[PDB]
Amino acid sequence: KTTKGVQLLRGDPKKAIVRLSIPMMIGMSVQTLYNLADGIWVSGLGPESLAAVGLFFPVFMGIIALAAGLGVGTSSAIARRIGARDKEGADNVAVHSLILSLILGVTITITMLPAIDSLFRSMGAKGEAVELAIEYARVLLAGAFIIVFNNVGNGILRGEGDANRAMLAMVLGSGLNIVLDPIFIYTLGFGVVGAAYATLLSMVVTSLFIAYWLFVKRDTYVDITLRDFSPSREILKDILRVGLPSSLSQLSMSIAMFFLNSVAITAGGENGVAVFTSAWRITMLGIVPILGMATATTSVTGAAYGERNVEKLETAYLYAIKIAFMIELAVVAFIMLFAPQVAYLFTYSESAQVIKGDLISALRTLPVFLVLTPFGMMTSAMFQGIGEGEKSLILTIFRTLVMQVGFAYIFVHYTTLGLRGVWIGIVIGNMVAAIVGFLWGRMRISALKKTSA
Amino acid sequence: EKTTKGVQLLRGDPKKAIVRLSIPMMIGMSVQTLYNLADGIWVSGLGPESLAAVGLFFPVFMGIIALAAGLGVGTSSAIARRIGARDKEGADNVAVHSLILSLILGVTITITMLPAIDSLFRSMGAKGEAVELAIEYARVLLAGAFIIVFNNVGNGILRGEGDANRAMLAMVLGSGLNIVLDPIFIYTLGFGVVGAAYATLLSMVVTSLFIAYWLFVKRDTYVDITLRDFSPSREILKDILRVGLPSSLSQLSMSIAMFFLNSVAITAGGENGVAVFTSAWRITMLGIVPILGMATATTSVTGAAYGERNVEKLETAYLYAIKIAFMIELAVVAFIMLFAPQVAYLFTYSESAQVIKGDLISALRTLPVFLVLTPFGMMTSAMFQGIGEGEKSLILTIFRTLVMQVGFAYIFVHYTTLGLRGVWIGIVIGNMVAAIVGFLWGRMRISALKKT
Numbered sequence: 001k002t003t004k005g006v007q008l009l010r011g012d013p014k015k016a017i018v019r020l021s022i023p024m025m026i027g028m029s030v031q032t033l034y035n036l037a038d039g040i041w042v043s044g045l046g047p048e049s050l051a052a053v054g055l056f057f058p059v060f061m062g063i064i065a066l067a068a069g070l071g072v073g074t075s076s077a078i079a080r081r082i083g084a085r086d087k088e089g090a091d092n093v094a095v096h097s098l099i100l101s102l103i104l105g106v107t108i109t110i111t112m113l114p115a116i117d118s119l120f121r122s123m124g125a126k127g128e129a130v131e132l133a134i135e136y137a138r139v140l141l142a143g144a145f146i147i148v149f150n151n152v153g154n155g156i157l158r159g160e161g162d163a164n165r166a167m168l169a170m171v172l173g174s175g176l177n178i179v180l181d182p183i184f185i186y187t188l189g190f191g192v193v194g195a196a197y198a199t200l201l202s203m204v205v206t207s208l209f210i211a212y213w214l215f216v217k218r219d220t221y222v223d224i225t226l227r228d229f230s231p232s233r234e235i236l237k238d239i240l241r242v243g244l245p246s247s248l249s250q251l252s253m254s255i256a257m258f259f260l261n262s263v264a265i266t267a268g269g270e271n272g273v274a275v276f277t278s279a280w281r282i283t284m285l286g287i288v289p290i291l292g293m294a295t296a297t298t299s300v301t302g303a304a305y306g307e308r309n310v311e312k313l314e315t316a317y318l319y320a321i322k323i324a325f326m327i328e329l330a331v332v333a334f335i336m337l338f339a340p341q342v343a344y345l346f347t348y349s350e351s352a353q354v355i356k357g358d359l360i361s362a363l364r365t366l367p368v369f370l371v372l373t374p375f376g377m378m379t380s381a382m383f384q385g386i387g388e389g390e391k392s393l394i395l396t397i398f399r400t401l402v403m404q405v406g407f408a409y410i411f412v413h414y415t416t417l418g419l420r421g422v423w424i425g426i427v428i429g430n431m432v433a434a435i436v437g438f439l440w441g442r443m444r445i446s447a448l449k450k451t452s453a
Numbered sequence: 454e455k456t457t458k459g460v461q462l463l464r465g466d467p468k469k470a471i472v473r474l475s476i477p478m479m480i481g482m483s484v485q486t487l488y489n490l491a492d493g494i495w496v497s498g499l500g501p502e503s504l505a506a507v508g509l510f511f512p513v514f515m516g517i518i519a520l521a522a523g524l525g526v527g528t529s530s531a532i533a534r535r536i537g538a539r540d541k542e543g544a545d546n547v548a549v550h551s552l553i554l555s556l557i558l559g560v561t562i563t564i565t566m567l568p569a570i571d572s573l574f575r576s577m578g579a580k581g582e583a584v585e586l587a588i589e590y591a592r593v594l595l596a597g598a599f600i601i602v603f604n605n606v607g608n609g610i611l612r613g614e615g616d617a618n619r620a621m622l623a624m625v626l627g628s629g630l631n632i633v634l635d636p637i638f639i640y641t642l643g644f645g646v647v648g649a650a651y652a653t654l655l656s657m658v659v660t661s662l663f664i665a666y667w668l669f670v671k672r673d674t675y676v677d678i679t680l681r682d683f684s685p686s687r688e689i690l691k692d693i694l695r696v697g698l699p700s701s702l703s704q705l706s707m708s709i710a711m712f713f714l715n716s717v718a719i720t721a722g723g724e725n726g727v728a729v730f731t732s733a734w735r736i737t738m739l740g741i742v743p744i745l746g747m748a749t750a751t752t753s754v755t756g757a758a759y760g761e762r763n764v765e766k767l768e769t770a771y772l773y774a775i776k777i778a779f780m781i782e783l784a785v786v787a788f789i790m791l792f793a794p795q796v797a798y799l800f801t802y803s804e805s806a807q808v809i810k811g812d813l814i815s816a817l818r819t820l821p822v823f824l825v826l827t828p829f830g831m832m833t834s835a836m837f838q839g840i841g842e843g844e845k846s847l848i849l850t851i852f853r854t855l856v857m858q859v860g861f862a863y864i865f866v867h868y869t870t871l872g873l874r875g876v877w878i879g880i881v882i883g884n885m886v887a888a889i890v891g892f893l894w895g896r897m898r899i900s901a902l903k904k905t
């Protein structure tokens with residue numbers, strides 16, 4: 001009656017952390033490669049097409065944040081039921097979340113469609129860029145329910161230890177999107193709106209395979225039928241308590257990036273942002289693996305929590321920080337050692353602009369934040385795992401909006417540090433947040449020990 | 454005896470066989486669809502005359518296929534039944550008879566249609582560059598009619614013994630080669646639209662070389678193919694024609710209805726109504742591909758089960774195919790409807806786009822529903838062919854196209870004022886009736902097979 005995923009999920013915590021993290025790293029890497037490739041294809045379309053994507057980008061990220069949020073809340077809730085050997089509960093959560101995906105998906109479409117014109121012109125943007133952005137938006141807003149469905153389906157798979165198929169769904173969608181991208185944009189001559197359709201079709205195909213696994217093969221651990229589903233305010237509250245703050249964390253990180261951009265303006269001007277933009281884009285080499293471990297950390301800590309096994313929860317939590325820290329250590333040492341070569345690609349590539357002198361400096365300072373990220377992110381993943389999303393959000397706000405923005409701001413304004421002060425501030429702010437996160441996580445775990453006793 | 458994987462499939466679990474014999478056909482057809490799409494792009498770049506020439510020739514091409522595919526299904530179903538009946542000698546005999554028939558039929562098609570193709574096109578189409586090109590295009594493929602019939606018979610033999618994979622391979626190789634040769638003949642060699650006929654013919658010939666090689670040289674099929682001790686049989690010929698002949702007539706019945714349904718849209722949507730449903734027809738030919746795969750699988754499996762005299766196994770296979778086809782079509786139909794305006798755009802890049810586009814969007818939110826009903830009728834028809842009663846399949850086709858669909862579309866136009874919108878409804882309603890009556894007929898036929 002038990003699948004390989006569930007065996008893995010409830011087994012040795014260390015094996016579970018590693019083997020559930022790896023597929024997600026691969027899946028997110030392909031997603032990253034798509035994002036990277038699409039940005040290159042769009043940049044060959046001219047200024048108005050680039051602006052159109054820019055107008056819609058925050059809206060798109062808002063949809064993803066909402067979709068991924070519901071997915072994490074789903075994954076966490078299921079993992080805790082499964083850890084508690086409450087299969088009926090796990091089944092009931094799965095059905096609940098799928099219905100919520102439809103509700104949220106349609107809600108996004110109905111709300112955003114009549115509001116995108118006004119929103120896009122609030123930028124002061126006008127002409128073709130706005131009209132292209134509207135046409136681009138209507139394509140993805142139409143498949144809003146597909147986006148949420150795919151994320152929920154992914155959450156269900158992760159939550160029951162099936163990170164393998166969660167990965168496959170991601171590689172399927174993103175992989176097809178990579179292939180379809182230059183075909184729709186250039187070969188078929190659709191232009192920037194072609195990238196919109198390339199994404200949409202890729203998500204539909206992904207949805208078909210997910211729906212096939214969930215409703216036709218029905219070879220998931222959880223049983224998804226319309227008669228184990230007893231409508232539950234409690235389940236709904238459980239999912240939302242992790243889902244909503246998860247989306248709000250994104251917004252928090254979003255607003256923080258905007259503030260850091262303004263700080264970089266004061267520090268080094270318009271090209272100061274260019275150095276900053278290139279800087280954190282590079283660090284994603286390190287962020288991507290940590291994101292993968294966060295998903296596994298959430299499900300493993302959740303499984304241990306439902307099992308009422310605080311020691312196993314503690315072991316998984318601490319082991320995840322340990323492994324992520326070692327992974328980052330290599331990544332950061334690597335980026336530092338080949339900073340002239342990494343900066344080179346971008347900076348040379350556009351021969352007319354040159355900012356390598358500062359990017360190279362930035363690549364010898366900023367990446368250091370990557371070795372302290374695991375402390376905040378595993379703690380956050382663990383909070384999501386035990387179903388306490390508000391704590392995850394509070395930590396994220398403290399790190400991003402208060403510490404990073406605060407330290408970057410102060411160094412630029414009250415010191416000689418200058419543009420380099422932005423990188424120092426972020427690292428120092430991260431250092432303090434890492435300490436707060438780790439102590440809080442361990443504090444929360446140890447309080448559970450007391451409670452179980 | 455030394456059997457093959459395909460034979461083991463036919464004699465084993467019907468659900469497994471339905472799946473393993475239907476999927477390869479869809480894949481083969483999907484590559485054919487890729488070829489067709491690419492060819493349409495090259496042809497449309499040659500100008501309106503070349504584009505109109507293809508439209509004029511296309512019914513002639515369908516006429517050859519109707520005869521070729523007809524003999525193929527008659528061949529495949531007969532082989533499948535005798536394999537189920539453990540009648541190896543009969544299976545060998547069907548194969549040899551069909552191969553000889555392919556020569557006779559192919560030659561006869563060329564002999565009779567070639568001198569009558571010049572008079573046929575002009576009497577209804579006057580002239581133009583398009584008329585001249587369409588005639589030249591027809592003469593090329595009419596000349597290679599034997600190759601076309603031989604390929605379908607060879608394909609029929611492969612499917613009939615459960616080797617759908619090699620049938621798929623033959624289809625993929627031919628279309629894949631046609632994909633490469635197509636722009637070479639059209640552009641590089643500067644033959645124009647007629648170049649596409651050369652590329653297709655050459656691809657078909659190469660396909661025949663693979664098939665001939667498998668059947669005559671390597672001879673690694675389950676069936677034995679040899680003229681040694683060959684004895685012509687009326688029983689074998691009747692067994693082939695009782696499915697093969699009505700199969701050809703069914704396609705004739707569909708085309709006769711299509712000529713009517715295209716003119717009903719004239720009284721409904723004007724002359725634009727012609728290109729209106731011609732477009733709709735093209736989209737749905739894409740939509741029915743999985744159904745066609747299910748049907749060919751159904752014929753073989755129900756055929757084998759009939760040969761085994763296992764009615765329960767026959768019934769399982771038949772209902773299971775409907776089950777899968779129904780599920781697949783729901784996904785197809787939802788896609789086509791929920792994402793419809795996009796689909797119409799890819800066929801309407803011409804002047805006065807809106808009326809040809811915007812009507813067909815409406816058709817795309819309504820007409821696709823028929824694909825949901827179709828498997829109940831089509832698997833029934835495929836089951837009729839499987840048991841060797843092709844005339845019942847023909848009767849069902851006539852009732853659907855010539856009676857229900859034309860009848861309903863007619864009355865919707867002549868007695869209602871919905872016009873074009875009613876035409877789609879008329880076809881869908883007529884499709885509903887035929888699917889239910891058909892499924893009911895099949896269910897009674899199976900119930901009778903259990904008696905005596």
Ligand SMILES: CCCCCCCCCCOCCOCCOCCOCCOCCO
Nearest residue numbers: 004005008019026030161162163164165171
């Ligand atoms: C460029 C990206 C490469 C993509 C292809 C990678 C192949 C991955 C093959 C592994 O996937 C196996 C599918 O697993 C099915 C579901 O497994 C359920 C959980 O099983 C837990 C045991 O994990 C075994 C890992 O191999």
Ligand SMILES: CCCCCCCCCCOCCOCCOCCOCCOCCO
Nearest residue numbers: 012014015018022025285289327330331334
């Ligand atoms: C310069 C590019 C670097 C990119 C980062 C790539 C990260 C990939 C992560 C690879 O994961 C390998 C982790 O393997 C763990 C090693 O085995 C764990 C041993 O732990 C001891 C406990 O053993 C219990 C079972 O694991």
Ligand SMILES: CCCCCCCCCCOCCOCCOCCOCCOCCO
Nearest residue numbers: 033037040041044178179180182183186187
């Ligand atoms: C992770 C690797 C990504 C590789 C690129 C994506 C490959 C997609 C599959 C191949 O698609 C073929 C489509 O061919 C389109 C050809 O377009 C060439 C003309 O482009 C000119 C404009 O270039 C703008 C960007 O510089």
Ligand SMILES: CCCCCCCCCCOCCOCCOCCOCCOCCO
Nearest residue numbers: 625626627629630659660662663666669670
């Ligand atoms: C993607 C399309 C590529 C097409 C390549 C060309 C293929 C041509 C057909 C290949 O058939 C392979 C056959 O192998 C050679 C067989 O030689 C025949 C001679 O056999 C000797 C005995 O036969 C006597 C009767 O011919």
Ligand SMILES: CCCCCCCCCCOCCOCCOCCOCCOCCO
Nearest residue numbers: 600655658659661662663665666667669670
């Ligand atoms: C792009 C065109 C490639 C042509 C390759 C020509 C090489 C032919 C070598 C011999 O063919 C290989 C085996 O073919 C099977 C031979 O046995 C039967 C001969 O064909 C008889 C069937 O009738 C169909 C002939 O067109």
Ligand SMILES: CCCCCCCCCCOCCOCCOCCOCCOCCO
Nearest residue numbers: 552553554556557679680681682683684685
């Ligand atoms: C196109 C096929 C015509 C063949 C008609 C009937 C021929 C077989 C009937 C007689 O049985 C033959 C006894 O078998 C002897 C073994 O060798 C068979 C070779 O027969 C060659 C016949 O060739 C006729 C071609 O015109």
Ligand SMILES: CCCCCCCCCCOCCOCCOCCOCCOCCO
Nearest residue numbers: 699702841842843844845847848851898901
């Ligand atoms: C418009 C074309 C009509 C073609 C012939 C129409 C005659 C058939 C009418 C419908 O037939 C219904 C018969 O109902 C059950 C038949 O039972 C099986 C008949 O097959 C007979 C062969 O075996 C006889 C053993 O009983």
Ligand SMILES: [Cl-]
Nearest residue numbers: 183186187188
């Ligand atoms: Cl191209």
Ligand SMILES: [Cl-]
Nearest residue numbers: 209212213217
């Ligand atoms: Cl699968």
